[PDB]
Design a protein around this ligand. Sequence first.
Ligand SMILES: Nc1ncnc2c1ncn2[C@@H]1O[C@H](COP(=O)(O)OP(=O)(O)OP(=O)(O)O)[C@@H](O)[C@H]1O
Ligand SMILES: Nc1ncnc2c1ncn2[C@@H]1O[C@H](COP(=O)(O)OP(=O)(O)OP(=O)(O)O)[C@@H](O)[C@H]1O
Ligand SMILES: O=C([O-])C(=O)[O-]
Ligand SMILES: O=C([O-])C(=O)[O-]
Ligand SMILES: O=C([O-])C(=O)[O-]
Ligand SMILES: [K+]
Ligand SMILES: [K+]
Ligand SMILES: [K+]
Ligand SMILES: [Mg+2]
Ligand SMILES: [Mg+2]
Ligand SMILES: [Mg+2]
Ligand SMILES: [Mg+2]
Ligand SMILES: [Mg+2]
Lengths: 519, 519, 519
Amino acid sequence: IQTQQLHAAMADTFLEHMCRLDIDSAPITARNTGIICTIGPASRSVETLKEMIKSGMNVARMNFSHGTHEYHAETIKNVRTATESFASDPILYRPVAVALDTKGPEIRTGLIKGSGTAEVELKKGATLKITLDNAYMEKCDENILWLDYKNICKVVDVGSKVYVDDGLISLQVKQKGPDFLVTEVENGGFLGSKKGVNLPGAAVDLPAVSEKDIQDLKFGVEQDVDMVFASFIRKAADVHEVRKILGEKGKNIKIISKIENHEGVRRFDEILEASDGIMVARGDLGIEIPAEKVFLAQKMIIGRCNRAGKPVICATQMLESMIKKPRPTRAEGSDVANAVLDGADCIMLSGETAKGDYPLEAVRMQHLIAREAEAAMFHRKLFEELARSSSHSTDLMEAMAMGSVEASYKCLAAALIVLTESGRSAHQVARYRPRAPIIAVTRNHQTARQAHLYRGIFPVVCKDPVQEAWAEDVDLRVNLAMNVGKARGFFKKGDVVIVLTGWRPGSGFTNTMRVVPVP
Amino acid sequence: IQTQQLHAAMADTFLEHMCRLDIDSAPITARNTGIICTIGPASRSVETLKEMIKSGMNVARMNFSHGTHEYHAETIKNVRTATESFASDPILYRPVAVALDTKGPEIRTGLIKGSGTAEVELKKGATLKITLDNAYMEKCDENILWLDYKNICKVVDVGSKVYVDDGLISLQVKQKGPDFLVTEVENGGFLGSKKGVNLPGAAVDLPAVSEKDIQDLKFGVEQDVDMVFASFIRKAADVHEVRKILGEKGKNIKIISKIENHEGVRRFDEILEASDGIMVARGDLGIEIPAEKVFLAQKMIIGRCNRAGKPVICATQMLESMIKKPRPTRAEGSDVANAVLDGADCIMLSGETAKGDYPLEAVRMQHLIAREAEAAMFHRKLFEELARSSSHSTDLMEAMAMGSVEASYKCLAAALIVLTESGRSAHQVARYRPRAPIIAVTRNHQTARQAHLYRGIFPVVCKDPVQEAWAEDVDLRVNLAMNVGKARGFFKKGDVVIVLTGWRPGSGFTNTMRVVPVP
Amino acid sequence: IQTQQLHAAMADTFLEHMCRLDIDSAPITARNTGIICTIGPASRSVETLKEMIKSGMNVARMNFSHGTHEYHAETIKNVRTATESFASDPILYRPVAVALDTKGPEIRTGLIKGSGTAEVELKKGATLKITLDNAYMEKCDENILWLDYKNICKVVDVGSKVYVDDGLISLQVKQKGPDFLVTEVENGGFLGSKKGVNLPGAAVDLPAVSEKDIQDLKFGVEQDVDMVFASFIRKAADVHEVRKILGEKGKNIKIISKIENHEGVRRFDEILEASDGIMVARGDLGIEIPAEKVFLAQKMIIGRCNRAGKPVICATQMLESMIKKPRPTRAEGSDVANAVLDGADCIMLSGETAKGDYPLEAVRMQHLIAREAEAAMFHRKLFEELARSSSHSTDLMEAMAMGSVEASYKCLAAALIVLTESGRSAHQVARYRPRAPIIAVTRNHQTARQAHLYRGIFPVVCKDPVQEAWAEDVDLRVNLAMNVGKARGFFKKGDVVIVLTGWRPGSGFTNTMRVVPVP
Ligand SMILES: Nc1ncnc2c1ncn2[C@@H]1O[C@H](COP(=O)(O)OP(=O)(O)OP(=O)(O)O)[C@@H](O)[C@H]1O
Ligand SMILES: Nc1ncnc2c1ncn2[C@@H]1O[C@H](COP(=O)(O)OP(=O)(O)OP(=O)(O)O)[C@@H](O)[C@H]1O
Ligand SMILES: O=C([O-])C(=O)[O-]
Ligand SMILES: O=C([O-])C(=O)[O-]
Ligand SMILES: O=C([O-])C(=O)[O-]
Ligand SMILES: [K+]
Ligand SMILES: [K+]
Ligand SMILES: [K+]
Ligand SMILES: [Mg+2]
Ligand SMILES: [Mg+2]
Ligand SMILES: [Mg+2]
Ligand SMILES: [Mg+2]
Ligand SMILES: [Mg+2]
C-alpha cells in the first residue's frame, strides 16, 4: 500500500485518479496548506496561543470589525509573546504571521423607537419606507427605516432588493426618490436597531476605506503587521487606495483583497492584478450573491489566482459546526478538502477559534484534512496545466522553479530547500505546486512570516550572522534546513532533497539547483 | 514571425501543431540528429573526407560485407587523418566516430569481373545461372552468378524467387542442379559485386557468428572502433555473443543491433534490452518483409528506443536518388523529415556516400532536413509522453535531466552544457529531448565520438590538463563549451544556457544545474 | 489474433501508439484513401485502363500541360470505356472520376524533336541555348531549347539558374541576349518534352487564367470532367477567376487548387477558403521552395484542410522509382504511408502511370500501403482533435456525423452506409474520420465519382427507379450497400453496421442513424 496517494498519482485521467483514492494510503507529516486563525476571547491568551501554535496555527488574524487598538494591540502582544516562547529552539522555532482584517465600508440602519434594544416586526407583503432624512435617524419603526448610506438611491434600482440583518430580512424596492426608497417586505421578521444592510448587485460608491479604516491601517503599520485583509474590495482603484494609506512605510505589507460581492466578482481580474493576494470572503459573498453560486465564484477565484501565482485564501464557515462541537459535519470535512483540492493556498477559521468552545480542535481538524487532501491532488496534471498557463513567460526564476518541481517529482524528493531573502524564489516554486514541502531559509523574519501565505512554504529563520565565505554561508543555511526537516520528521538521513541557491552573493535568484542527500 | 517553429510549439493539439508549421519559421544553426556515412570508393579519399566532416558527417561506417580488412583499415586511416586535420583549433575540431558494419548470417554474391566496383546490366527475361563454382567466385557477370551459400540449393525449389541487392533483382528459379541453378531475370537492372541475397521465407541456417564475424570483430578491436553495427541480429542471444567476442578489450564498444528480418522485429524487445542501440535496417528488411510494412516496424522500433532511452538509427534509401542526382525526390525529403520526427537519434547514408556521384551534397541535404524537422518536433507533448513512460524510474540522474530539459524549455535556453566523462549524464539529458543543443564537454575521446549516437549531443574534447581546483577545472571546461557554442554560432553573449556539472569531483553524475548567461 | 492495429488504437499517448504498431496486425480489406492516376502515353489503352481500375484507381488526371485537346479527349473516352465495361454487374461496378489538370501561370519548354514522348540526355558541363525562336519550338534537343516565356530574358540575370523539369536539371545563365539564353548544363539528365521551368525567385508576371487556360477550362466543361486541378494558384482571386470561367454550366465542378510556390503557401488560408479542395503539388513546390521545407508545407496544408473539412491531395514523386523499378524505395514507402497518417484524403501518381514501365505495380503499391497506414492512424486522438476544431460549429448534420462515427468506433461497426444525393452527409461523415468504410449510396453519378475526393467514401450508384414508398426506397438502397459490401468483402452476416438516412424525403440531410446487423 503506497503512501500519499502515489497510486492515484499515477493515473492517466481525472476519473482514474478519483477511482484510485485510498483511505489506507497514508499521507506525509508535512502539511502544506496555511491555516489562518481568527484570534478572540477563546484564543487570546498566551497559553492558548501556545496551543494554537502547537496545533498548527500559521497566521493570527485580527478582525478589526470590533475591538479597540488597545485590545488588538494586546492580542498582537500575546501572539508575539506566544510565538517567541519556542525561539529558544531555533530548530523548533516556527514563525507566525500577523494579519489585520479591516472593518471596511458599511451600511447601518438607525435606532428603533430611539432605543438600541427595541424591536419591531416586519411582516411579509407590507410596505416599508427607507428615508435618508436624519430626522428619523432614531425614529425607525415598522413603517420607516433610516440608514447610514447617503447615496443609496443613486446605486439601487427599482426592483432591486435591500437586505437587512445579514440577509435575514429581504426588501424589494418599488419606488425611488432622492431621499427615500419605498419597499415591500418579502422576507419578514423582527427588526432591531443598527442592523447591517446589503445591496445585492449594487455598484456602491462608498469609499474604498472608511475613516476608521485609515486609522486601523496606520495602526497596523505602527504595529508592523505582515498583511492586511482588505474588506469589500470592488475594483482596482480600491486596492490602490489601500496601498496609498499603507504608503512607503508599509510598502512591504501584503495586501490581500477580500472578494465579497458581485462587483468584486465581476471586476476580479483588475482587482487581482492590483493585489498581492486574495481572500474569498464567503460570508458576505454568500449574503450578497445567491448562496448557490458561491462555489462557482470560489473555484473561479482560486483557479485564477493559481494561474497568476498569487496567494489565495478560502474562508468562512469551513468548520462552523465546530463552534459548539468537538467534531465537524460531513459537509464541513468536505468543504475543507475541496478547498485544498481547488488550489487554495490557505484556509481560514473565524468563529471557530475566535469564540467557539473548541478552538484547538478546529485547528487540528483543519490540519488533518489538509494533509489528506494535499496527497490527493492530481499533481502531474496540475503541473502540466499550470505550465501551459504560464507558457507566455520565459522568466528565469520560473524556469528554475519548473525544473526543480519536475525533479522533485521525478525522484520523489522529500523536500525542497530554497534560500531566499525576499521570498521571491520560494514563491516561484510554490506556484508550481510540488508535493514535497518547500523549506525556505531566510534571514528576513518578515519574509519568513509572510511565506505562510504560500502553499507548501515552510519558513525557517536563520538567526546567525554572515560568514566570510558565501559558499560556506550557503552550506550552513542549507544544513539548517536539514536539521529542521529532520527535527520535523519530513525526512531522514538518506532521503533525497532538491536544493536551490544563488550561485553567488549578488545572484538575484536561486539559479543553482541540486539533488542532494540528507546527512 | 517566430523562429524555430515556436508558434507551432505552443499548440494544444497535434492537429494544431501541424497547422501552425511555418515555412518562414527559421531553424537554429545546431543540427541535433547525428549523420552516419558509409565510406567507400566515392568517399574514401582524405580530401573528400575533410569535406565530409565539414559538411556534417559524425560517423564513418565501414561495411564489412564489402572490401577487405585491408581496404577498411586504409579507409579508417584517411578517416582519422582527415578528422585529425582539424585538431589544431580545438574550437572548430570535431570528433568523428568509426563504425564497423558486420557481415552476419547473410548470403553474398561474388565479384563482377574481379572488381569490387564492377557492375553489369541484367535484362528482363534473360537467363542466369547461379553456381557455387569458386572458379567463378571473382568471375561474376551477366551470365554467371556465384554465391556464397552452399546449401542454397536444397533451400530453394524451382519456381521460387531469388532476390539480389535488397530486392533490386528478382530471379525466378528455373532449373535445379546440385551445384547450381538456372534462373531467369524477372526484372532488369545493374549488378554489383558482393550483393546480398534474400530468400524471404526460405530456411537458411546461418550461425549468428561467422568465423569471419569473429575475424571482423577482432579486427574492429584491432582498429579501436567505436561501435559495432551487428547485421541481422535475431535474438538477445545473438547480442551476448558479439559482446562475448568483443570481450574485455572492447567492453567499451557499443553494440548496435541491426533489425533487418521478421525474427528481429518479433524478438525486438529482448534484443533491445541487450543492445546499446538499434538500427532500423530497411534495405534488407524491406525485402525480408512486405514493403508496405516497413514503416510500422520503423515507427514501432523508434518509439521503443526512445521509450527505452537508447539510440536508434534510421537507415537506407533515405536519399537514394542522389546516388546519381544533385537534388533528391520529394519522397526522400519526406523520408528524412519524418524519421526525425519519428524520433531517430541518427539517420544514415549508404550508397549515397559510398559510391554515388553526389556524396557531399547528400550529407548536406540530410543536414538541412534534419534542422528543419528538429524544429517541427512537438516537444511539449513529446516530453510529457516520455516522462510518462519513464515514470516507474526514480533515478537521480533522470530527475536532473528532466529538471534540466524542463528549465531549458521554460527560458528558451540556448544550449545545455554537460560535463561528463562516461557521457552518461549527457545521454540522460538527450533522452528527454531538449529543443536546444547539448554541448557535451569531455576529456575522453571515445565518450566523445560515442556521443554522436545520441540526438542533440555536441561533443567537445577537452585536451587541457586537469586543474588542481575542482571549481576552476569545472569553469575551465565550461568556458570551452562557452567558446564552442560561440564559435559554432550557437549562442552569443547575453544568451542563456543551462549548465550541468558535478558538485564535487567524483560526483557520480551531474548533480548540479545552473542557469547562466553567456559571457 | 491481431488486426487493424486495434491494440495501438488503445494507447494512451502518441508515443505508446507508435510503440504498438504491429507488422503482424493485419489490415481490413477496404482501402480508404483515394488513388489518383495521371493518365498518359503509358496508360491511355482501354486494356490498361481496365487493369488500373481493377488495380485500385479511383480518378484519372489529364494533364493539360501536356498533349492537345484531342489526345486528352480520346484518353477520357478510353477511360470511360474501360469503366462502363464493368457496368454489367452494379455490385462490382466502380465509378472513376475524371480530373482536369490545368496549365496555369507556367513556363513550358517545347517538343523534343517534334515528339513529346521523346527524351534527350544532357551531360554535365555541356552548353545549351535557350531560345524563343518558334522555329525550334518543336525542335528541341541537346543543343537547342525552346521556351513558353518571351520575357524570360528580362526576368533572369547572368550567373542565374534555370530549372528544368521540377529541378531535375539545373542551368546556369552564362550569357543572355534579347532573344535567347546561353547556359551551361550543371548536372546531367534526361531532358524531355513540354517540361517545366522554374525561375526560382524571379518576377514572372503570368496571368492567373490564360486564354489557353480559358480554352482548356471550357473544354473540360464540355468533356464533363468532375473536377479541376487548378495549377499554380497564388491567391483566392485566382480561384474566383477559375470559378468565373467555369461559369454556370460547371457550378458543380470541383475546383481543386494546387499549392506549388511560395505565395500559394503564404496565402493558403483564403485560397483554401475559396477552393473546394487542395493539392500539394510537391514537384513544382519542391523547386519553388527549398527542398528541405516541403514537409512543413505538406503537414501545415493537410492539417488545415482536415480542420476545414475539405479534401486534400498529396501529390508527386511518391513512387518515383517505379517508373523504372517494380519495387519502390524505402523512402517511397514511408512517404505514402506518412502522407496517409498526415491525413490526405487522396494520393497521386504522376510519371509512374503516365509514362513509367510499371503503371499497374505502382497503383497496387499505393493500394497496399494506404490500407496499412489507414490502420495505423491514431483514431481516438484524431477524432477528439477534430472535434476540438469543429467546436464552434453546431451544425445538425455535423452532430449526426460525429455521433455516428463515435458509435462506429464503440461497436467496431464494419461500415457506415450513407444514403445521399448531394453527397454532403457523406462528406460530413468522411471528415470525422471513422476507421470503417463509408458506403455512400446515391443516384447521382457525379456525386459518386466526386466521392473519391473524400477519405473513406465508397460510392455506390443506385440505378433503380424511385420507389413510391420512401421506406421501401430507402430499404432498397440500404440493401444495395449491403450487397455490395458483402460482394467487396467488407462484411459478412451478423456484422454490424451504422446506417445514415433521412426521416423523410428531402430531409436536407441524414437525420436518422441506426445500428444494424448484416443480413
Ligand atoms: N567498402 C566498400 N567497397 C566497395 N563498395 C562499397 C563499399 N561500401 C559500400 N559499397 C557499395 O555500396 C553499396 C551500398 O553500401 P551498403 O553499406 O549499404 O552495402 P549493402 O550491400 O547495400 O549492404 P548492407 O545491407 O549491409 O547495408 C554496396 O552494395 C556496394 O556496392
Ligand atoms: N499527356 C501526356 N502525354 C505524354 N507524356 C505525358 C503526358 N502527361 C504526363 N506525361 C509525362 O509524364 C511526366 C510526368 O507527368 P506529370 O503529369 O506529373 O507532368 P509534369 O511535367 O511533372 O508537370 P506537373 O507539374 O503538372 O505535374 C510529364 O513531364 C510527361 O513527360
Ligand atoms: O469578511 C469576511 O471574512 C466575510 O464576509 O466572509
Ligand atoms: O543492412 C542495412 O543497413 C540494410 O539492410 O539496410
Ligand atoms: O502539378 C504537380 O503535381 C506538381 O507540380 O507537383
Ligand atoms: K473585518
Ligand atoms: K553488412
Ligand atoms: K499541369
Ligand atoms: Mg465581510
Ligand atoms: Mg546497404
Ligand atoms: Mg542489410
Ligand atoms: Mg505542377
Ligand atoms: Mg508532375
